[PDB]
Structure formats: C-alpha cells, structure tokens
Amino acid sequence: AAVCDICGKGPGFGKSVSHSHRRTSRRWNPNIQPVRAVTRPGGNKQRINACTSCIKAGKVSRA
C-alpha cells in the first residue's frame, strides 16, 4: 500500500460521507500487486510492485 513502482501512484487521502452527510477522514490506497514479469526476451523475470493501471498499461509483457 506504499507506492507503485512505475506509475508513481501514492495513496490519496479523502473523506468518507454518510447518508446524513457527516464527514470523516479516510484514505485510498492504489491497487498494488507484485508479479514476476518478463524483462528481457532471454527469460529473465523479476518482481516489482505494480498496480492494475500499470499492468493494463502493459509495460510488463506475457508469453
């Protein structure tokens, strides 16, 4: 819940809301997961904290 490696997406802070509409401070943390992505076409794969936005950005590739 810290940071996504490439997108640079630090979690943002905002306030929730009731139906009565009374505020309270809360947070949002980007959807971060690690995968053993492919780096070089030689087969070397490594792990990097990536979010869904980055994944669908598809800098990381699959076989």
Q: Which residues bind Zn ion (CB under 5 A)?
A: 4, 7, 9, 51, 54
What CA–CA distance (Å, rounded) separates 5 from 51?
8
- Secondary structure letter of residue 51 according to DSSP: E
- State yes or no: residue 44 binds Mg ion (CB under 5 A): no
- State yes or no: residue 52 binds RNA (CB under 7 A): yes
Neighbouring residues of 22: CB distance < 8 A, sequence distance ≥ 6: none
Nearer to Zn ion, 7 or 60 (CB): 7
Interface residues with RNA (CB under 7 A) are: 1-4, 9-36, 45-47, 51-53, 55-58, 62
